[PDB]
Amino acid sequence: ASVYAWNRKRISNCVADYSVLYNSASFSTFKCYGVSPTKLNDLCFTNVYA
Amino acid sequence: GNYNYRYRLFRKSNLKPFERDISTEIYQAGSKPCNGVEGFNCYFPLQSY
């Protein structure tokens, strides 16, 4: 969708693997600010918003 | 802007008390083998203020 009409998605109640996206080089920029991108698979929160 | 003052940002492990490390090498931030080529998942730990 457009930049001013950006799509919003809610993710909850499943198992999420971040290694597959972490190792993929098809993305030019992968900037993580909350925590270290390496330790994403260990700690987790109640929900995710995309 | 004085840039002579710099410090190490990345390291595989922590530092034991009362010791010095002067290893200025590329740091592998992911699974990509740097091999002294930098690039993705490969950064310079030393940087200034």
UniProtKB/Swiss-Prot annotation, chain A:
Effect of residue 26 to P: In strain: Omicron/BA.1, Omicron/BA.2, Omicron/BA.2.12.1, Omicron/BA.2.75, Omicron/BA.4, Omicron/BA.5, Omicron/BQ.1.1, Omicron/XBB.1.5, Omicron/EG.5.1
Function: Attaches the virion to the cell membrane by interacting with host receptor, initiating the infection. The major receptor is host ACE2. When S2/S2' has been cleaved, binding to the receptor triggers direct fusion at the cell membrane. When S2/S2' has not been cleaved, binding to the receptor results in internalization of the virus by endocytosis using host TFRC and GRM2 and leading to fusion of the virion membrane with the host endosomal membrane. Alternatively, may use NRP1/NRP2 and integrin as entry receptors.
UniProt subunit comment: Binds to host ACE2. RBD also interacts with the N-linked glycan on 'Asn-90' of ACE2. Cleavage of S generates a polybasic C-terminal sequence on S1 that binds to host Neuropilin-1 (NRP1) and Neuropilin-2 (NRP2) receptors. Interacts with host integrin alpha-5/beta-1 (ITGA5:ITGB1) and with ACE2 in complex with integrin alpha-5/beta-1 (ITGA5:ITGB1). May interact via cytoplasmic c-terminus with M protein. May interact (via N-terminus) with host bilirubin and biliverdin, thereby preventing antibody binding to the SARS-CoV-2 spike NTD via an allosteric mechanism.
Protein name per its UniProtKB record: Spike protein S1
Originating organism: Severe acute respiratory syndrome coronavirus 2 (2019-nCoV)
Taxon lineage: Viruses, Riboviria, Orthornavirae, Pisuviricota, Pisoniviricetes
Gene label: S
Parent-record interval covered: 348 to 397 of 1273
UniProtKB/Swiss-Prot annotation, chain B:
Region annotated Disordered, chain positions: 9-44
Residue numbers spanned by region Receptor-binding motif: 1-49
Disulfide bridge partners, by residue number: 34-42
Impact noted for substituting residue 38 to D: Increased replication in human TMEM106B overexpressing cells
Superkingdom, natural source: Viruses
Start and end residues of each stretch annotated as Immunodominant HLA epitope recognized by the CD8+: 2-10
Effect caused by changing residue 29 to V: Increased resistance to neutralizing antibodies
Phenotype when changing residue 40 to P: In strain: Omicron/XBB.1.5, Omicron/EG.5.1
Subunit structure, interactors included: Binds to host ACE2. RBD also interacts with the N-linked glycan on 'Asn-90' of ACE2. Cleavage of S generates a polybasic C-terminal sequence on S1 that binds to host Neuropilin-1 (NRP1) and Neuropilin-2 (NRP2) receptors. Interacts with host integrin alpha-5/beta-1 (ITGA5:ITGB1) and with ACE2 in complex with integrin alpha-5/beta-1 (ITGA5:ITGB1). May interact via cytoplasmic c-terminus with M protein. May interact (via N-terminus) with host bilirubin and biliverdin, thereby preventing antibody binding to the SARS-CoV-2 spike NTD via an allosteric mechanism.
Protein name, entry field: Spike protein S1
